[PDB]
Amino acid sequence: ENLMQVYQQARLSNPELRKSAADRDAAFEKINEARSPLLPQLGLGADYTYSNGYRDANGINSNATSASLQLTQSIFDMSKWRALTLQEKAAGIQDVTYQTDQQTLILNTATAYFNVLNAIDVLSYTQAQKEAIYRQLDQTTQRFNVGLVAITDVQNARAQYDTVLANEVTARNNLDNAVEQLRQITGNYYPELAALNVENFKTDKPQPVNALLKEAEKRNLSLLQARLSQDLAREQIRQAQDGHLPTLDLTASTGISDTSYSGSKTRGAAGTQYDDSNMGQNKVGLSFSLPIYQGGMVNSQVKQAQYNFVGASEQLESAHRSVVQTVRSSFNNINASISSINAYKQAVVSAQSSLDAMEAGYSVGTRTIVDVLDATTTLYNAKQELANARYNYLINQLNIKSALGTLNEQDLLALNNALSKPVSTNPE
Amino acid sequence: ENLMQVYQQARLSNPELRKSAADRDAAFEKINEARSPLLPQLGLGADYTYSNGYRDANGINSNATSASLQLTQSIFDMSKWRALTLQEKAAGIQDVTYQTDQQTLILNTATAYFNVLNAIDVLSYTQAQKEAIYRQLDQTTQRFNVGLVAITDVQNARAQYDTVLANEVTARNNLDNAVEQLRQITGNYYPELAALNVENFKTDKPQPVNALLKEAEKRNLSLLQARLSQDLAREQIRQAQDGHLPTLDLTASTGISDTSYSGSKTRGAAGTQYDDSNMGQNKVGLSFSLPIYQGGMVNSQVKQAQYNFVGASEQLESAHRSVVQTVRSSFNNINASISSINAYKQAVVSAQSSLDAMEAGYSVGTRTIVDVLDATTTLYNAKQELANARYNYLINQLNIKSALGTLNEQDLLALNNALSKPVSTNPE
Amino acid sequence: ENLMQVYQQARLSNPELRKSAADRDAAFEKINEARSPLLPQLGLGADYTYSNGYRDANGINSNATSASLQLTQSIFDMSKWRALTLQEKAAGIQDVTYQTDQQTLILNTATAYFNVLNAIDVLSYTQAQKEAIYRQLDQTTQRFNVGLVAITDVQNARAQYDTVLANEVTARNNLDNAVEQLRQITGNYYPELAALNVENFKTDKPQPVNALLKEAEKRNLSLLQARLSQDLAREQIRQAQDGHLPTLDLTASTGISDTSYSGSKTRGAAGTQYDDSNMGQNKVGLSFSLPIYQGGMVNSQVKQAQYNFVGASEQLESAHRSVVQTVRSSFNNINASISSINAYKQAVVSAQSSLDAMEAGYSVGTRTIVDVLDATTTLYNAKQELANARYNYLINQLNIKSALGTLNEQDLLALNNALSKPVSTNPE
């Protein structure tokens, strides 16, 4: 099927990405984990407690039975608020990766596709080679059959042929694995897939890396992912800087306290005191806590987070040149890829007229037919080689589109569009 | 020596594996950790306090002389139970991970093994290459000695030769290399291993992938490791589901309270109250703790695990198609691997008579001896390439077994079967 | 320019390294964290409570007006002491990790360095290739212009040429590539670096592995990093051994207790008791806490660490043979590396006269000029390959130094010594 359909099936059917999607979600969910702390704290304990003294305190004993409701709010404590934005930035960062992931599958989506095609391509080529080398070896036999050759002559082409199987075999295997690569990502055995339409494929001189480089710099996701990551730890700078902060928290609870004395010193005058332990109480208010001196723990930590931010600060640079280098990297790849095709494109023509060289050389019976097959084999090679390049240039686009981050399902269609007629994977 | 012991040796001597076995064993301890808390917690503590009022509460003073014994138990908490099953799965996965290293170790031991043969193998080749290529260079000078060549023939011929030298040493390097590969996992200098025996060696047709794939699916351990990985995540959601329940736990304490008052408000008539009095007490019972509202934290927690499982849920599918892939991965390999030998095996035959063609042609002297060296050396290359594929098929054999999960120390034996007579690595 | 500064530059400008230095520095802070707790913990807190009975305890009411100061110290806990040494080792390892990046950075700076030379190198080659291969194609048409060729010669020849173009651009690509490789670590556009000087360049025989291996064993830092890694785990068991001991800690508090009763049971004759009292108090002393039974948790904990150390214990052996391997890894490399140059160095000589053979043959015109271009370009390939091995030996030099751990900014200097006269990367 065409790449977009190839894609759409995969973009849903792709489990890796699909894992990203979830892995994306749990993040944004964690935001909830983030805020709930900013929520009041509601809960219920209960305890069955019996005090029994074994000493002078003996005889003074009771069943302590109690029920209490409790809620506390975090009065003063921005570190949570800090930590809040942290997961906020986590979400943003974690958000980043998924965005990467789309292109990733996007990227990989095209890859295996045309790979299948390449295997589709090779699978096409090598057979013709076998279609030839068999012949060559074939009549060599009948040269030995005619005795016009010796057995090494006999033998060499024999293996020389069998090496073809040694090729074609692996080819189809590659054919199949071409399948699985796509079925893996996609999840379906795909009989056919769109070949590359040659007349409608224009070699396209790409953009200046200067802008694109700056383009993805606003864009490129890992570089994006780091930047927020640099942004992320930035708060980590200020999370442990929230250890400095004192805390104040809402203190709210209620419940019944029910006691009955027991044992010896439960026995007495009671003085309007000794009675059945039964009541309930209410305690409402705040809890403020200001750390004064912890031993520099919060101090050392800040630097820790601080010096983290440095390496964090590092990673931007470590990332930026990379994304930088990544930029021209893809850039120089496509152009080189541009060059190759124009070479092999020439090359195809080479074999082309070269291939003709057989026919009008064969139809005049000057040169043999197997040779035609030989050259017949050859043309497909560039048609192999060329095709491969024809995929690469398309390949590099996404990588660029990828590295740019500009890569989108529009960068996919431009692939899919030049995809015009399908070819099956079916080895015959 | 023999791959079996060679395996068997490093099977023990393998630090990785041994690390694994322990590392596996390490986890299986952790299960204990999980259950531990569900035991009573018996503990003891001591505190020396002195309370001095600095205000109207001044003169309210005593030695705080106190100690007590404390035990604690968990009555109702499922999360601990959750924790209980969790590490069970962790061990469940961890346990799985271990076997992975068997085939892992198993795979390697065979893996690095034949490389010795290869390194041995090629080394055999390249040596004769020098024997061939040198004598050529050897004769070439004889021409320049007869003037029959110029130096250009000579320098290149010499150069032609030297590359041979360049070639060979690396082998011996690789020789040791391939040797050390084994020593690495194994750890013992090995003079000679039993190489493949062309007599026993049998190219062998495997089972249907559709059958194989299922089998490993019951077998392949990473995939197994995957399901438990997923299965592992199963708990976690249920773990995250365990913030709901209240917690009931066993509350027990005993110890002495020894009170000596002090200061002005300790002084007086004492009101039949104030006086260095010293006691000890017991508190035993349950802690029921029912969460009410954490802010849906437990709630958002779950979804976290929820997606968390699903993103894991991907891995199954993610790994399954891949393990499906791997299923089709090597199953192709071996077959194409099969095609390999059949080519070179013929190809050997090709060179075989090719050699023979030489010797006779040299025997009758119609041709030089250098050619025989050429071909003779030439023969080895196939015989060289031969051993490789001979191993590679064998190599892919286990990989399938690994991928299948069918791999075992019996599958080692299968390899261990076609190895007849060892030969050293010592370069002569 | 010069590798030294080139190194020296990125040695600072290297974000990775700099990350490391900080990252190293980051840990060394954490040591502070470890010691911090063993300091007194000075702290302050405030709570506003109001207690209202809703039952017979109703009318039992007051403003809870309270605040206090609190400091805390650890008297006897070794685990903290354990914690103390732990991060010490962590720093101990972390400290080790840092140097790794020196050689790391050191290795790279040299590493990516000569690639510039290579990229420079090959680029020099391929250019002449075009000069050769074009003129060929150039003359070929002249034949087709004379009819002396058909187009098949032509197209292929043209095709033959175009591949050259395909070839070269990648170099320049790689040119920038190799350039950016350096800028990545370094970060500055570099016109020209000093290339290898065939005059100073000396193939040099190393020390005995048996001697070298030991040396790195005192040196190679990952292995060093390993032992501390093991050494690190040493504590942890002992850490896990520290759940045994009781814990004695300094218990100190001061603050005001300001009590204003309220409600019905606040009202009355007060019994010389009920009233708007307000106080402040001091509590100082020790916390002795002796664990008794956690369920063997401490016990099972240890074994965890116990095996944990051993599985780590593997790494030593695991890494040791490997570092042993690495010892034999490159030590072979360099030597085989040596063999490399000796071949190509001759090989250069082979092409050398080979060129010369051409020029004379062209000088006398016995042959075309294209050949000279062919050979002339041909010469570069050796001269091309030459520079590589020339670097590779040099390259392996440091790797050994790294593997040895002997690698340093002096070893950079050794490389920095054979670099005579820089040359730009700018493709002309």
Residue numbers in the entry:
A (entry chain A), B (entry chain B), C (entry chain C): 1 to 428
Per the authors:
Drug efflux pumps play important roles in intrinsic or acquired drug resistance to a wide variety of currently available antimicrobial agents. AcrAB-TolC is a RND-based tripartite efflux pump, comprised of the outer membrane protein TolC, the periplasmic membrane fusion protein AcrA, and the inner membrane transporter AcrB, which cycles through three different conformational states during the drug transport process: access (L), binding (T) and extrusion (O). In this study, we report the near-atomic resolution cryoEM structures of the AcrAB-TolC pump captured in both resting and drug transport states.
We explored how the full pump accommodates AcrB in this functional state in the presence of puromycin, which is a validated transport substrate. A 5.9 Å density map of the full pump assembly without any imposed symmetry was reconstructed from this particle subset. The correlation analysis of the map region corresponding to the AcrBZ components shows that the three AcrB protomers in L, O and T states are in a fixed spatial relationship with respect to each other in this full pump assembly. This spatial disposition fits very well to the crystal structures of numerous other drug-bound AcrB structures. Though the AcrB subunit densities match well with those in the crystal structure, no puromycin density is detected in the cryoEM map. However, the interfaces between TolC and AcrA, and between AcrA and AcrB do not change significantly in the different transport states (LTO, LTT, LLT).
